[PDB]
Write a protein that binds this ligand. Sequence first.
Ligand SMILES: O=c1[nH]c(=O)n([C@H]2C[C@H]3O[C@](c4ccccc4)(P(=O)(O)O)OC[C@H]3O2)cc1/C=C/P(=O)(O)O
Ligand SMILES: O=c1[nH]c(=O)n([C@H]2C[C@H]3O[C@](c4ccccc4)(P(=O)(O)O)OC[C@H]3O2)cc1/C=C/P(=O)(O)O
Ligand SMILES: [Mg+2]
Ligand SMILES: [Mg+2]
Lengths: 201, 201
Amino acid sequence: SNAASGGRALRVLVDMDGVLADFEGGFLRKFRARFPDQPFIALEDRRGFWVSEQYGRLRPGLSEKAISIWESKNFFFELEPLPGAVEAVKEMASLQNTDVFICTSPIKMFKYCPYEKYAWVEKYFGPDFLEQIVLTRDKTVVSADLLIDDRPDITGAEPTPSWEHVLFTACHNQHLQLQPPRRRLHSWADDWKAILDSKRP
Amino acid sequence: SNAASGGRALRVLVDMDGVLADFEGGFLRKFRARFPDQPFIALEDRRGFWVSEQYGRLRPGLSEKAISIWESKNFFFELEPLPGAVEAVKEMASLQNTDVFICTSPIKMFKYCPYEKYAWVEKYFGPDFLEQIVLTRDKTVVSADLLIDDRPDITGAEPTPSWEHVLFTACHNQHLQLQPPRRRLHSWADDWKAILDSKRP
Ligand SMILES: O=c1[nH]c(=O)n([C@H]2C[C@H]3O[C@](c4ccccc4)(P(=O)(O)O)OC[C@H]3O2)cc1/C=C/P(=O)(O)O
Ligand SMILES: O=c1[nH]c(=O)n([C@H]2C[C@H]3O[C@](c4ccccc4)(P(=O)(O)O)OC[C@H]3O2)cc1/C=C/P(=O)(O)O
Ligand SMILES: [Mg+2]
Ligand SMILES: [Mg+2]
């Protein structure tokens, strides 16, 4: 909930894909359904942020087939929420002096993706939560106390972002050793409130 | 153009409606075409940021008719650029140590608007410029040196934004007296380079 006027609430940016929405699981399900004669990468075996790069190493042509999955209509809209993600963000947004923004990047092929992300937030969080969406390809220019995001390396035009990046665990990053004092949120069942409280005055 | 790595380019946020895209002219054209038996508000006579409020005072029911114009498919996509706007932003983005983001708010009815804004930027600035788009309902959480925006009062969750807000003249704000030391950009023919240079080291 917002601070009283002129005041300063703790501000938390929450990524969508891989944090709220199950991109990896959705991808694999739809890939196997569309391309059942192709090999695939079990989640346990995912390595590197970029799905298509790993698929491209697995067999020639597979990078382009992978890309076609997330370029398809309804791919983003039909992603299932991560366990605990909707409940956690609803709780988080209800906390005093706590402003939560869903800060997500659309893919370059814009025909479906931005629309479906707004539709997905409406679906799970309601119409009033649409006020909390920020779409950007550069998160470093969005100011906040915390950024919860599954991507290990978040870069952009601001060399010294104001947020602390808390790495949200995903199949593709779960084995990564981080430079101290970088930290993780393992899942929404993990203690996200302790992380927020650590940044409060 | 971006700064060399680790470095800090001047960062300029540019609004879309009323700054790059002619919302007021597009609105009036389509309103008159759809509702030719209704009275309308000539641009010279526009007062207050909110079109529908002024229309609602003009005749009962007209606020809802106004709203229907910007909720229609192709309303945003078919907006014409302001004179000089495309050329200015292309030049601005080409300048050394200058990072330009188009920072715009989608309307609440998300079916067409976000998509059409990305399509409009592709159309006028090209595919690579899609990297520079930020969609947000809160510009105060986007950090920059300058925000060029026709809305007089820009507020949100950050009580002390990092940008200086430069008011872009529009029919609805042209008579407004601003609190010193707030300033204006009258049009894209006005000297925007002097404004940027005033913020450089
Ligand atoms: O984790 C991911 N893994 C992944 O393989 N992808 C796919 C989807 C598509 O996304 C992009 C992408 C790059 C940067 C930011 C968002 C998406 P593109 O828009 O360039 O096609 O990069 C290549 C592709 O990779 C996206 C994501 C998630 C992106 P985020 O959660 O929005 O930051
Ligand atoms: O100048 C304007 N005048 C105007 O009458 N409107 C119309 C369009 C619609 O926009 C909204 C609006 C409110 C805040 C930010 C963007 C749009 P809504 O999403 O709530 O329907 O407010 C009421 C409506 O008013 C928008 C704008 C421009 C908004 P901006 O350039 O994106 O900041
Ligand atoms: Mg992600
Ligand atoms: Mg505007």
